[PDB]
């Protein structure tokens, strides 16, 4: 068959040893009448990927543990290779460029028939973003231009949750916003929230290089999350609270620090995957009642994939796009993922 | 001059007395160019008065005390008594029937500008409800019908409160609410979630004479909320979780039973005055990713008065005000009010 | 097989005859995998359905005439009587009570997968409500309460129609609303803006007898469109223009009236389907720069049956449902369409 | 006193003359106690200010030249030169860098306290920004940064304009947006509709320079509106029709041609001011049953001052003002208004 990695390890806490990614050999995969089997020729490395592998994961620890070895890779573009008679009839056809959503909705339940089919209840997830053919339903499966830069638009999938989170947050006109991580979504955060009018925009992180990196991508200020005093200079910086706030780091200090960031009547979004003891202690009185605040929750997002689709043009990924790697060498970008150094990792998947 | 009520105390914990309120004389007050005197026919009682009085007052508690003897009443109707020469200009006129809005904006800071008039920064509040005669600037004054019935519309002000909550918890067509307290407001709250088309309305309560009380308004069930299983019935009972939760009681208990009850992608309002220790622990991972909860606050609501006049004639009062007193009286009402039995009182202070 | 009604004639200009509808014998339909049959037991007939038949057709008079003898009918509720194996396996059973969506979506085409699938590419529609059993597939098919009376929920579908007016109208709590037309979807409107908090509805007809049912269904004001003056009283009476207006007549002297009636920033909806010459003059002065109106249209609605069904307790169409007949008696049911009396008609299928 | 500019005649169509403006003396204005004079620095010229001289003026014609000579100019910055004592109170001081908001809101009008102050019924509007001192009500003053650039900040008002037929246009991320007409506002709708996420951004207009001026603002095409078959070619490079419509020209031909570039539940925006017989025809049938299209107009703006003031430092306006002259040059500069070639002209007022 073909080339395809597979998760063969999770974190054991009780040995101290980190999760394990490898390749092996999968069958060709064929579609059925409304299915599509895509070429794939980049695919990108995740942050949920980071923490299925090194990552602290609750109850969920032992189902996971229960299905390896598992196929995994959700963002992803290609080429379509090979279309069900159903599928070519509704337009698909070999040589179209695309990319995937993983995401399978039923059509069926209530929340699908509300239009909440980021909440649909008989929920599929394909996770094969990792191999060199993946087939998908023709429902999951979008055409990008036929100029398009295959490695730009493996970003399709993140940017739909980037455009959520941005959505969620009310970025607009002359709004203030703070971006909690100066990771990939962070990277792309920025450059949404200037593309939604914000006057002003403030990153938070721990590490320099990547404070160095949100400037870059047209921060106004990047500040050290770990500096004691920081929620002051960020509010003298934007001369007040922040409008809009997202939490993208998943941890619980940067949590309470948005929500303390965060101006009356304002929104924070959290839209990352939270570890163990998850708690925002939420103060009724002072944060809600006094400041009319707005908390949100975000997950996966709904029908943003032709938006996002059509951003593209509009973001500069050479600012967060940090390293290329054959599926060859697999080894190193995971590597270079575990290193937690760089926004965003692509593997070119035909070398 | 005239009648007049003050706070004479307010909770002295260390030595466990309640707070008083006392008739004293006061002079009739005079209205400059831009301010209208009111005859004060109607004046309601509200939840924030009974906290002063019987409340746990936090760092608030030193300052209030300072400035005893203090005029209070916020919610009040009555008839134009005497005319500044801007105010007639405008069209205000003596014997207009109106209600008052307690709240002057400064119509120059920021947040005025911005339309937020509910966080001015030089916020001025005028608190002479519980007065037979009181001046407001123009601005605050509000015509109703001639024919109006002056007790109803004397609940205008709290009406605005309701409004602003219903509508930040986005009851509308379909929805399920959950509303947490059987007092004035949640009554108001049952009849707007009937009035925005909600297809599912449980209140929660400890006292089961207000739960009857709930269902006369036109809830479709009423739960005790001290009686364990209680979620689970009421989710039973609404087939799911709730799209709108509305926390009234100003307790963390129903606070966090609350934010339980709340549907994926549900809004939840913190509308209440909270006290001591007023903490909900949010978790990230729960509340917020996998489900995507909204959680919001509401300080006083902007723009609502027309609203809140226009459906008063919507509204049936004779199923929340259930006790009225004279001014003379208002020993009674009172004590009526520190029973915690009513929903809402009012005085007739005229008499 | 079974009985169905089919339209034999449409409206012929050139004879002046009017359509005809004719009862035939139609096969047993069978479902597919995905597809679900229903033994129907209530249907309804709409405004839709009479244009076809009385009614002027445009360039899309010849292409319908072409295609005699049609299946028609799209409001029904019934019963499962058979499923294909995979909706069993999504949770369709025989016996559940249920209705349809004409409208099939095709999930992959670009409006599809914006959200937006009333402007679905690759639109389908299964027509064939006037039939004693009809297949749908699974996407199609919604469940309703296990005690629901199933004639009430045959109005499901204009009930979809007239939420989706409502909301695009902005109803809500204290606006003025004005409803042109005072037919079934009319009177759903009158209920719903009652249900969405309007303080002021006013209907306008031609018809007297359908004026006095707009009362009875909750308006307040119920006005002669043709008696000149109409307007002014009309606005004499809201005390001012009107909030939302709804355009339900198709005719254009009742499009433009509404225009005028309506307030500064006020919303228009036009979901009504036109005949010839359907203009509507905009004055760009007076109606959009100086009263900063908004217009809007309404095609089909998206997402809305699942409220739909959560509404229906809460209406009453004892109000608006004047008759029913049994299929056997298909021809009466028809003449009282033609008659143009009465607000909605319904056949009972399985008589 | 000082040096003001008046409009001494206007449009004389039975003769064919043109308008006139020109400098008499004005004394010195003093403020009241709540108000605040300006020493103006910067003045812009608008579309308005143009339309009043050399434009057709309606019935409003009589009236307009009943009161010539008229002060006029409402875009302005400049310093704090005088303040009452209840301003100083309220924080401004003499030195102060700030603009002006030509309208004055009542304050106690029913529009005025739902917050549609842009609807204000007893609306007073203070036009002397063709002045080198100004007096304005507090509330109608604004600070601006310290080290601000006051030609900028000349044009926050046109800004606020620009700001809200963009938020009505409904401006957002991946949509496509077309502007007709290649003035000033049309190139703050370019840069503002790059600021709000558009990925596609087509300009039409008669004259080429001015095409060409929309690519240096940030168009992606530049189209002459006179051309035939311009449709086509604009929806040809969009992909598709237009899902935000602009209209700044006034004239009925370009409002015509936006509502026919509008998709399918696409937004219109008409907020120029109209000339004789402006009618812009609406299909009902095909507009908006069919294509679900929205139109809207637009008055003034509301509470966009410090959102404007916000944005000033996002724009560039050294592609937007395109001359400056002196107080003591007006008549060129008003000879360059009449050319019609620039987008904005500032006039410096203290030279
Ligand atoms: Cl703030
Ligand atoms: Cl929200
Ligand atoms: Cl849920
Ligand atoms: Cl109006
Ligand atoms: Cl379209
Ligand atoms: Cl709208
Ligand atoms: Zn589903
Ligand atoms: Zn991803
Ligand atoms: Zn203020
Ligand atoms: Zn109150
Ligand atoms: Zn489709
Ligand atoms: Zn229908
Ligand atoms: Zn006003
Ligand atoms: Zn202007």
Known sequence: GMRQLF????????????????MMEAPMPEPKDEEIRIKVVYASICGSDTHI???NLGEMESTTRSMLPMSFGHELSGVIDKVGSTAEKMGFKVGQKVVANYAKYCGCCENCREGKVNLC???????NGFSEYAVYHMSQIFPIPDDADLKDYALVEPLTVALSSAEQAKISYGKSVAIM??????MMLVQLARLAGASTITVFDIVPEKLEL??????????????????????????????????GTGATAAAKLGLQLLARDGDAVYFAMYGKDPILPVN??????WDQKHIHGMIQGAWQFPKSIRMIPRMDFSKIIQKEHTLTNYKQAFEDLYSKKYAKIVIKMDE
């Not at 390890?9 to 490898?22: Q, W």
């Open 53 to 55: 592998l090194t990552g």
């Open 121 to 127: 209840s008989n929920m599929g997830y394909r996770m």
């Open 284 to 289: 009724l009185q002072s944060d809600l009642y």
């Open 214 to 247: 949100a400037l870059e991508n047209g921060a106004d200020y990047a500040l050290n999350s770990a500096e004691e005093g920081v929620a002051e200079r960020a509010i003298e910086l934007a001369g007040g609270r922040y409008d809009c706030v997202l939490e």
């Open 181 to 186: 991580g100066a990771g990939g979504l962070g």
């Open 7 to 22: 998760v063969t390890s999770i974190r054991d806490f009780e040995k101290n040893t980190m999760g394990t990614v490898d």
